[PDB]
Short mmCIF file of C-alpha atoms and ligand atoms in Angstrom, two decimals:
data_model
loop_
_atom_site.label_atom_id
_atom_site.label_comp_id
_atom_site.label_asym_id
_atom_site.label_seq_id
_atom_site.Cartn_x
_atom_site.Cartn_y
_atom_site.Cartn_z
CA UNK R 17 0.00 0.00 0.00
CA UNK R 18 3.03 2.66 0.82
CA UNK R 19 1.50 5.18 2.57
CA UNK R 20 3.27 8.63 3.73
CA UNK R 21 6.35 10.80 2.68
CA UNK R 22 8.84 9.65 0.93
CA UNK R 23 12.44 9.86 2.31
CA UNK R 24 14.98 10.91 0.24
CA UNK R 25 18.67 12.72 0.50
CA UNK R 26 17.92 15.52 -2.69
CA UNK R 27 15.35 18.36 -1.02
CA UNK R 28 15.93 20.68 1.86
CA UNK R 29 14.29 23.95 3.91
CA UNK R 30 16.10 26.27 5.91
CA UNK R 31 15.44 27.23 9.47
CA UNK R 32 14.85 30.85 9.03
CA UNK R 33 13.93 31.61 5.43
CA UNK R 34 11.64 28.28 5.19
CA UNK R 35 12.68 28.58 1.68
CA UNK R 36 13.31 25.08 -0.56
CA UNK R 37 16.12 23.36 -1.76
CA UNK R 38 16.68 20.71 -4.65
CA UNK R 39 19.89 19.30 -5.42
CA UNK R 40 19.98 18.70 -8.97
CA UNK R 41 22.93 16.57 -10.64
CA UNK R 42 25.37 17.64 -7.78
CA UNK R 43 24.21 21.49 -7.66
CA UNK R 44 21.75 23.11 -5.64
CA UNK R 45 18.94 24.61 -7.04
CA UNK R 46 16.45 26.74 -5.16
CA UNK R 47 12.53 25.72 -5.93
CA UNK R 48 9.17 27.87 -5.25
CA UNK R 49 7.10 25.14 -3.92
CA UNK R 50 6.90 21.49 -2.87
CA UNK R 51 5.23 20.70 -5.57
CA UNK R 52 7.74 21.57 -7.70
CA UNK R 53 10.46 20.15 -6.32
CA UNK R 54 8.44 16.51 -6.58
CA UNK R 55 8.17 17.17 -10.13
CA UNK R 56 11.51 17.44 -10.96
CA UNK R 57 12.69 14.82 -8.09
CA UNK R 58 10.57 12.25 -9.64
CA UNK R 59 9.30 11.48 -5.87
CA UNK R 60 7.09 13.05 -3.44
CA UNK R 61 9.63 14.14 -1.26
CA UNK R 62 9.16 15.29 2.27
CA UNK R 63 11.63 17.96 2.63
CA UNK R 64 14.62 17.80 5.52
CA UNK R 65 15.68 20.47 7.55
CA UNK R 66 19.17 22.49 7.19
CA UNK R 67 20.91 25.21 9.08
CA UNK R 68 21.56 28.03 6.04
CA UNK R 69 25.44 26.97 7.22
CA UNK R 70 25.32 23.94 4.87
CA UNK R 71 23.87 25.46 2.19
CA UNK R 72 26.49 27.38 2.04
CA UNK R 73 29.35 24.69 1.40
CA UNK R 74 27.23 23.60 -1.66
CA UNK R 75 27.12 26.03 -4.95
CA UNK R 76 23.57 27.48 -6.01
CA UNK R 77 21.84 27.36 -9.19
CA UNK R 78 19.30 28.87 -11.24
CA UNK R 79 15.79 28.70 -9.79
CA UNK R 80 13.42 25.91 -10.89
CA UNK R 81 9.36 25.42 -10.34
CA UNK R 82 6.32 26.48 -10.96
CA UNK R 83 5.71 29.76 -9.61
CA UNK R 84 1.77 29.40 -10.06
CA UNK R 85 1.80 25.95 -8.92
CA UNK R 86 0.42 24.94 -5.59
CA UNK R 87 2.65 25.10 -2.86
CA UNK R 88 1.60 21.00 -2.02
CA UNK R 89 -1.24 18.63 -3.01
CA UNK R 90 -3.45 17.81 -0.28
CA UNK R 91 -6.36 15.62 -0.34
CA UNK R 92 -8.94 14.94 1.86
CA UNK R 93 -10.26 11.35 3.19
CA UNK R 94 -12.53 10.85 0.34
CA UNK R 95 -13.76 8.07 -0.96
CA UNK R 96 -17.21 9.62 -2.17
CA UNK R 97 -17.69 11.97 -5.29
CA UNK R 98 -20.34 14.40 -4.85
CA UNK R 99 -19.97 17.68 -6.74
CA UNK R 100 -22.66 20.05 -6.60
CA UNK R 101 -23.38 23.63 -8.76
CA UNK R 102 -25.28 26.21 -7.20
CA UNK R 103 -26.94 29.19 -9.01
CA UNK R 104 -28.51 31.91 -5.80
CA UNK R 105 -30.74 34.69 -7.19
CA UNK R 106 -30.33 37.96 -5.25
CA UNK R 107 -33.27 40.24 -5.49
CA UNK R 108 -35.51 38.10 -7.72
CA UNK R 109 -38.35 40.78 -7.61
CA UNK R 110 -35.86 43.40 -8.69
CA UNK R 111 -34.58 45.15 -11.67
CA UNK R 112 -31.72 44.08 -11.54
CA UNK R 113 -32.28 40.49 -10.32
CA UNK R 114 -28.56 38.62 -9.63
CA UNK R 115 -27.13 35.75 -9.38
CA UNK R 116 -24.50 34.24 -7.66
CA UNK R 117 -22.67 30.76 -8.48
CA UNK R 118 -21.62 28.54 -6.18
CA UNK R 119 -19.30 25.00 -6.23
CA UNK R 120 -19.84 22.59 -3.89
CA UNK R 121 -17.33 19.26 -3.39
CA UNK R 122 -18.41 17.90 -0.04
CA UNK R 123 -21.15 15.86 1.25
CA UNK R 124 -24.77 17.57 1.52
CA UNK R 125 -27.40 18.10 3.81
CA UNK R 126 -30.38 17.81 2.27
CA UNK R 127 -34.04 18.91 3.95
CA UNK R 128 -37.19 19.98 2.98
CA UNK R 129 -36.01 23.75 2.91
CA UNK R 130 -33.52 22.55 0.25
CA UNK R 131 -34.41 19.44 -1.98
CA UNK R 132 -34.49 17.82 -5.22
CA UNK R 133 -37.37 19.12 -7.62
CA UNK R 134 -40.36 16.80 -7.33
CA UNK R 135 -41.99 15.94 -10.78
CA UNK R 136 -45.02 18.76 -10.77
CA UNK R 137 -42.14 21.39 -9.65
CA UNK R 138 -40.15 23.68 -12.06
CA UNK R 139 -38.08 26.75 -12.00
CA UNK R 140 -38.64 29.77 -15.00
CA UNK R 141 -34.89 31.11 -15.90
CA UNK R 142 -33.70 33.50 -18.79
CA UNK R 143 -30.63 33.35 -20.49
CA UNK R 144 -29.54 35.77 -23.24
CA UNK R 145 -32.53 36.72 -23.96
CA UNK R 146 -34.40 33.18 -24.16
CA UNK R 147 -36.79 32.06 -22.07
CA UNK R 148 -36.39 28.29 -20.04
CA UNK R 149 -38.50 25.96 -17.89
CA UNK R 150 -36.12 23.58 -15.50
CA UNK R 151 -37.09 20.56 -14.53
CA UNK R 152 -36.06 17.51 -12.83
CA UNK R 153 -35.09 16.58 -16.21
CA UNK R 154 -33.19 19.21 -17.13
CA UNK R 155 -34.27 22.53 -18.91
CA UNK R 156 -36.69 22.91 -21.84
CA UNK R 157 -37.57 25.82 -24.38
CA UNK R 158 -40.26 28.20 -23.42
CA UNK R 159 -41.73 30.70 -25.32
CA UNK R 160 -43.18 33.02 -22.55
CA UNK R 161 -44.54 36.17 -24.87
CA UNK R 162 -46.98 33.72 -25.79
CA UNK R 163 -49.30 33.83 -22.97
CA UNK R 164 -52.07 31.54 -25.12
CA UNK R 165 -49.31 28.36 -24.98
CA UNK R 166 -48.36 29.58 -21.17
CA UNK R 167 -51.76 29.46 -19.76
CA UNK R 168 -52.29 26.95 -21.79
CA UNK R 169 -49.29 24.34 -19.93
CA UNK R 170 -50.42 26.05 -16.84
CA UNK R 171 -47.72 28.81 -16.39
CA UNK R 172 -49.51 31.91 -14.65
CA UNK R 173 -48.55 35.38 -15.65
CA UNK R 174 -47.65 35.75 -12.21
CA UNK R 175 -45.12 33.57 -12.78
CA UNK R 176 -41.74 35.53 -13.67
CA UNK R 177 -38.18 34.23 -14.99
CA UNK R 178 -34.97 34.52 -13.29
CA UNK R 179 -31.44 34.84 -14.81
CA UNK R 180 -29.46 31.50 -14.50
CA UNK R 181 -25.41 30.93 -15.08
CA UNK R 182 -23.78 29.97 -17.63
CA UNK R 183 -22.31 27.37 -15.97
CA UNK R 184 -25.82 26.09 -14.55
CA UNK R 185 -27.11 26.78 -18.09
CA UNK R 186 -24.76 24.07 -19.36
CA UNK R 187 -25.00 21.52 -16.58
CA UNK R 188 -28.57 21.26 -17.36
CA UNK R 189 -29.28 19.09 -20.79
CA UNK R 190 -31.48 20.24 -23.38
CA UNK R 191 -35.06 18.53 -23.33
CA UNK R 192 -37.01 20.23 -25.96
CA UNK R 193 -39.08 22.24 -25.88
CA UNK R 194 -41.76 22.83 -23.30
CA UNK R 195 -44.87 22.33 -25.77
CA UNK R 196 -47.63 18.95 -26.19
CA UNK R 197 -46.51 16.81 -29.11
CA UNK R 198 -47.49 18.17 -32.61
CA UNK R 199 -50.95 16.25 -34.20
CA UNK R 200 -50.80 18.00 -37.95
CA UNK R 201 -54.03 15.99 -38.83
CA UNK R 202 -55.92 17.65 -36.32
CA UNK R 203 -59.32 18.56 -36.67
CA UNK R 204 -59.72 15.73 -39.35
CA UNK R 205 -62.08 13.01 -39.30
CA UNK R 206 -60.93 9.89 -37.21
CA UNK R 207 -61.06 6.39 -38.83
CA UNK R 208 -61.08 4.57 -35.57
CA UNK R 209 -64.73 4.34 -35.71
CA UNK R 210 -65.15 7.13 -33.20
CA UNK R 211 -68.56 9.50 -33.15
CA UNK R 212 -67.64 12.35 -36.02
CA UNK R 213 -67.36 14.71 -32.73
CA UNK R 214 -64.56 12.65 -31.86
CA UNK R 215 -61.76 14.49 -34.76
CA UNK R 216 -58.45 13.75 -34.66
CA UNK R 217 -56.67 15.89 -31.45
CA UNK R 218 -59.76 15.78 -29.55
CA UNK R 219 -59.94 14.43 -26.05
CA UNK R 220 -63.02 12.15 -24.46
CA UNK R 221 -62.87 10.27 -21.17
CA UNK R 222 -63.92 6.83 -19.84
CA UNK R 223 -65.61 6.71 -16.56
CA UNK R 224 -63.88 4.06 -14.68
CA UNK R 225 -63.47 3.57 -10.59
CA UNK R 226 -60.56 5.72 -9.45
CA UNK R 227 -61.64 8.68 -11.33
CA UNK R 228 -61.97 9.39 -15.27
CA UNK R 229 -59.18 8.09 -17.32
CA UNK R 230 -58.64 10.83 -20.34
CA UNK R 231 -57.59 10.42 -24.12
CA UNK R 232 -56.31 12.11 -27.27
CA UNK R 233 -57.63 10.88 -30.73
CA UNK R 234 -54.59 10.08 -32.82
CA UNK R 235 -54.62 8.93 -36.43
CA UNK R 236 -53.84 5.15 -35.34
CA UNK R 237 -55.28 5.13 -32.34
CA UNK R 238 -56.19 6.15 -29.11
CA UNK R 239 -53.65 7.97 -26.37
CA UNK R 240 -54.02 7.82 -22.59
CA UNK R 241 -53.19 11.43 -21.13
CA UNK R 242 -53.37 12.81 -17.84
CA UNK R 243 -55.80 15.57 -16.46
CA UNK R 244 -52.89 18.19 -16.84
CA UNK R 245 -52.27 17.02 -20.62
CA UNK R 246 -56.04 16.68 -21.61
CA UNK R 247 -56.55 20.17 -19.77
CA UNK R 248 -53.98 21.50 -22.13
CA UNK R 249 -55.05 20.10 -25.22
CA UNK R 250 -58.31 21.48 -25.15
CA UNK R 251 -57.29 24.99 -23.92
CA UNK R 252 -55.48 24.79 -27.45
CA UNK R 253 -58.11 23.41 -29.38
CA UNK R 254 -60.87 21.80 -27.85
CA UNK R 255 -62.93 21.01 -31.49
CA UNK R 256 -66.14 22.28 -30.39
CA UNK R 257 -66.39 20.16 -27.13
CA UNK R 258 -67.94 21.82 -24.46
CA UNK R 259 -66.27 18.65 -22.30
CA UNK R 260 -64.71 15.81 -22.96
CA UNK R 261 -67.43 13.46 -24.32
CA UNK R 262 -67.67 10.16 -21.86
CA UNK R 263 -66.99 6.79 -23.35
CA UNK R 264 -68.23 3.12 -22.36
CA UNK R 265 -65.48 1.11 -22.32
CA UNK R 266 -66.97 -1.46 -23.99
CA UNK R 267 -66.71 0.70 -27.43
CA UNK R 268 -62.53 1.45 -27.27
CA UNK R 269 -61.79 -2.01 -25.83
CA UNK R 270 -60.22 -3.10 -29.64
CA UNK R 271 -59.24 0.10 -30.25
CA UNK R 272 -55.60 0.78 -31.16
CA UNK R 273 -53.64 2.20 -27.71
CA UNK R 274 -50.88 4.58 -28.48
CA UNK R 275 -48.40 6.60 -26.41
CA UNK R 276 -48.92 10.25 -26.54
CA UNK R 277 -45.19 11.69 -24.61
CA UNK R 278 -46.55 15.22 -22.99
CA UNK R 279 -43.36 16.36 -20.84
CA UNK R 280 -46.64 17.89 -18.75
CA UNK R 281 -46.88 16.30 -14.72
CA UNK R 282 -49.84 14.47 -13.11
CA UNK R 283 -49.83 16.94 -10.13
CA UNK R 284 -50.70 20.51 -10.97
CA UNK R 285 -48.09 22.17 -12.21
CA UNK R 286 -46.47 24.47 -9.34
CA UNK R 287 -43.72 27.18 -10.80
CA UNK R 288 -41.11 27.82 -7.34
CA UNK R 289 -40.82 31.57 -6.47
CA UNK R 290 -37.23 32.42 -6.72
CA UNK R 291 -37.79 35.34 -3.87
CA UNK R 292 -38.79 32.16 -1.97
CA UNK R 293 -36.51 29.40 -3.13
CA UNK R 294 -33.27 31.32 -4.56
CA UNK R 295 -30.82 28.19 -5.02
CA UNK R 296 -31.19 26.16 -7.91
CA UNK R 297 -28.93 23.53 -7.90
CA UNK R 298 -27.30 20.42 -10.42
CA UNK R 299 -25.73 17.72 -7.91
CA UNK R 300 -24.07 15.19 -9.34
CA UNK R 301 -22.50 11.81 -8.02
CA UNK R 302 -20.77 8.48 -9.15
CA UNK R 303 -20.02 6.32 -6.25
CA UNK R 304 -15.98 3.92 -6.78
CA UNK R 305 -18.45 1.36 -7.61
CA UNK R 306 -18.32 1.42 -10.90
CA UNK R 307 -21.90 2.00 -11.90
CA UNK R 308 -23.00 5.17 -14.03
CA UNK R 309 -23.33 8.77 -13.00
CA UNK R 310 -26.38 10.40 -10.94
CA UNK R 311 -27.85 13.68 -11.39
CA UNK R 312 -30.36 15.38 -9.69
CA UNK R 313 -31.73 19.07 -9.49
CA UNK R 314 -32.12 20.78 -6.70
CA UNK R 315 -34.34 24.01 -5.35
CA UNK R 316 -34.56 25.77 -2.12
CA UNK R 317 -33.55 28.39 0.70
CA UNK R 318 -30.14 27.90 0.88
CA UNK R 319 -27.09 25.86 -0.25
CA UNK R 320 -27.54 22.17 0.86
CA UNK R 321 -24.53 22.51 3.07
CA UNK R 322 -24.52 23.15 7.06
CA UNK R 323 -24.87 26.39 7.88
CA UNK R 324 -21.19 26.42 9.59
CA UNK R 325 -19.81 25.40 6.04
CA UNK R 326 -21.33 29.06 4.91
CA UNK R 327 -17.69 30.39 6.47
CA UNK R 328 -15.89 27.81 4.67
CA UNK R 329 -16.76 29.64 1.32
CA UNK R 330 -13.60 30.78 -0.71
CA UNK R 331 -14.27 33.24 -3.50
CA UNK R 332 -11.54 33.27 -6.09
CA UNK R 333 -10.22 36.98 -7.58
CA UNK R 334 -9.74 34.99 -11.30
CA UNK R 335 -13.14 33.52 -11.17
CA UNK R 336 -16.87 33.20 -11.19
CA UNK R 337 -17.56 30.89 -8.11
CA UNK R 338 -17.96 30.44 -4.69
CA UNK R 339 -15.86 27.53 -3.65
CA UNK R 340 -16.81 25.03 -0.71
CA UNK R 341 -14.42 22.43 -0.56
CA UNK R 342 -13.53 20.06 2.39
CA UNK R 343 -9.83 19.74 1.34
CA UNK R 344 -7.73 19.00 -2.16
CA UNK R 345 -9.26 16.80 -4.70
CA UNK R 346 -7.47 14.85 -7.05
CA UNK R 347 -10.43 13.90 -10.24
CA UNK R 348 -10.40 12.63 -13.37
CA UNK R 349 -12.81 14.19 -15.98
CA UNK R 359 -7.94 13.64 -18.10
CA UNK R 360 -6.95 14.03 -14.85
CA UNK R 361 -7.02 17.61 -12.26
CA UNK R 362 -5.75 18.42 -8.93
CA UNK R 363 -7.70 20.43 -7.08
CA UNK R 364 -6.36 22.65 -4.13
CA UNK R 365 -8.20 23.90 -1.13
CA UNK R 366 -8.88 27.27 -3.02
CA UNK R 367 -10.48 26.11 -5.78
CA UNK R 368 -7.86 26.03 -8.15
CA UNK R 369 -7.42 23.28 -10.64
CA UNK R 370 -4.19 22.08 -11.88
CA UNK R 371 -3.50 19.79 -14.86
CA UNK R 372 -1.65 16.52 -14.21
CA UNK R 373 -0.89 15.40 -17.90
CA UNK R 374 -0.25 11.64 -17.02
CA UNK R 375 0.14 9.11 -14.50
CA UNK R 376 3.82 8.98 -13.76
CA UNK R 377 3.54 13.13 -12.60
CA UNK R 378 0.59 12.00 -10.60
CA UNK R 379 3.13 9.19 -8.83
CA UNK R 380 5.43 12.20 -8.54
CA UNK R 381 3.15 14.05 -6.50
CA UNK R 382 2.05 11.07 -4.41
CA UNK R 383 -1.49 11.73 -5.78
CA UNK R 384 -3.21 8.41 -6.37
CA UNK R 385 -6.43 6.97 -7.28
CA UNK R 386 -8.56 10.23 -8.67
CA UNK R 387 -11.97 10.29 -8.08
CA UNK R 388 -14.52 10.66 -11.39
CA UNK R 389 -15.78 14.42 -11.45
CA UNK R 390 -18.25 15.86 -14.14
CA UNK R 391 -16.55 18.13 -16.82
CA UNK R 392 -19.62 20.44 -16.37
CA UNK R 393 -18.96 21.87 -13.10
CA UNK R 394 -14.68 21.50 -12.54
CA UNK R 395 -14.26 23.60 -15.37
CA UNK R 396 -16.14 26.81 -13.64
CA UNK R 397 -13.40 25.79 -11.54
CA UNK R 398 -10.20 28.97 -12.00
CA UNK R 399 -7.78 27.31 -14.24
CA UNK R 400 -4.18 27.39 -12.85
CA UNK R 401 -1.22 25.90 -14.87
CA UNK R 402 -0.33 22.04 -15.78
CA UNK R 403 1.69 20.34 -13.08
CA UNK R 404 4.70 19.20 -15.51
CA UNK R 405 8.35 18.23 -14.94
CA UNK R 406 9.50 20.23 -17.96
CA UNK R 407 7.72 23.14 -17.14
CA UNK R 408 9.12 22.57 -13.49
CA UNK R 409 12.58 22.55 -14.78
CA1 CA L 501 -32.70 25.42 5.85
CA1 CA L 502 -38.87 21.21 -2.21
#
């Protein structure tokens, strides 16, 4: 297993200065950081003290290092992979609504003031000049000048859109967008053997036990939809139906069943107030074990993180985050080190990473470690 420093006879620090030392092919070169001096010493070194006497006996050299490189590679106890993205709206009634980004590497806590988005729930976002609806899914087109299609899919014009990140923009795929599937041959005639009310794109219902089950009319067959979906087809076009016409089973029983895919929820569809809710986050998580990647999307008061881990945060000068890290990561997206700041470093290949003493990188998603600042690759020949 080899665990802890490595011992060597090539890397010194003095007593007063606390300043490094590498001995290089019988010379003495100075070096910035620890990290550094690994890289050239092909080792992770742990350096040995020296009275600024001895240094003296031994010639100098020029400098090496990285001057921008980290000063050592810590890494917490982890284990676990949970990276988390966090967009916070300031002001969401204002002018002049902001937001504020936030990344998150450390385990949550989750409550119902801060949760993933159950299925009926979605958040209204603008982004250059585009309107979005997010979703546990991810985020979908939405034409909201169109107040017809809005209070049609049940959006009130209460309801009012926030700006989201760039980099939250991105986490969250593309669904398509937030409209009931296109039936071109509505209106027509159906050839199911339907009534003549019953035209293509209109919607009846079949009284059954647990409440009225509703469908569309689709050229080859029949659709189930829910209340929310048949509510919003006929707000469209209802084809002169005062109500959905009722249907005795017995008459659809050899009829043709079809899928009709409306992204719209069973529940009601509730929009979150931002003023109310003004984190919006895309958590993501891939346990060692193999296995595949999990995503989820979050909305509520505040950060999922204890409230003594709101200290914690790190803003960096070169950047567009809030960092809240529990210690140095080492991940592979191509492989990073991550310091304590925030900063990530490249480590081109394996045998730098052995050089370091960094081993075993956990799997992080591209999407949010690249919001992370970018600081320069950890390399030997750039160390020398
Ligand atoms: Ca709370
Ligand atoms: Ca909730």
């Amino acid at each position: 297993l080899f665990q802890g420093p490595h011992m060597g006879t090539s890397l010194f620090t003095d007593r007063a200065t606390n300043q490094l030392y590498v001995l290089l092919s019988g010379q003495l070169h100075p070096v910035y950081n620890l990290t550094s001096a690994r890289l050239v010493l092909g080792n992770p070194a742990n350096p040995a003290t020296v009275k600024s006497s001895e240094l003296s006996k031994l010639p100098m050299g020029q400098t090496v290092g990285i001057p921008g490189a980290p000063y050592a590679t810590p890494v917490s106890a982890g284990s676990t992979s949970i990276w988390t993205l966090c967009d916070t709206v300031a002001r969401a009634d204002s002018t002049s609504p902001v937001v504020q980004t936030a990344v998150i590497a450390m385990p949550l806590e989750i409550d119902a003031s801060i949760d993933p988005l159950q299925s009926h729930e979605a958040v209204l976002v603008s982004y250059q000049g585009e309107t979005w609806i997010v979703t546990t899914k991810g985020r979908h087109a939405i034409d909201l000048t169109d107040r017809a299609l809005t209070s049609s899919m049940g959006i009130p014009v209460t309801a009012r859109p926030t700006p989201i990140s760039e980099g939250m923009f991105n986490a969250l795929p593309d669904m398509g967008p937030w409209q009931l599937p296109p039936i071109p041959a509505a209106g027509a005639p159906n050839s199911l053997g339907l009534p003549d009310d019953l035209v293509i794109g209109s919607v009846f219902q079949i009284h059954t036990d647990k409440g009225p089950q509703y469908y569309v009319v689709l050229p080859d067959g029949i659709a189930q939809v829910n209340a929310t979906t048949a509510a919003a087809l006929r707000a469209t076009q209802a084809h002169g139906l005062v109500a959905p016409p009722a249907m005795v089973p017995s008459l659809v029983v050899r009829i043709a069943e079809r899928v009709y895919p409306s992204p719209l929820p069973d529940e009601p569809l509730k929009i979150v107030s931002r003023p109310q809710d003004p984190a919006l986050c895309w958590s993501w998580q891939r346990s060692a074990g193999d296995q595949s990647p999990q995503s989820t999307v979050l909305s509520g008061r505040h950060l999922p993180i204890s409230p003594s881990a709101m200290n914690m945060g790190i803003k960096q000068i070169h950047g567009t985050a809030t960092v809240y890290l529990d210690g140095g990561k080492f991940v592979a997206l191509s492989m990073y080190y991550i310091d304590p700041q925030g900063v990530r470093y490249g480590v081109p290949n394996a045998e730098t990473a052995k050089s370091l003493g960094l081993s075993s990188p956990q799997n992080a998603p591209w999407e949010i470690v690249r919001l992370l600042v970018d600081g320069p690759v950890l390399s030997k020949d750039a160390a020398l």
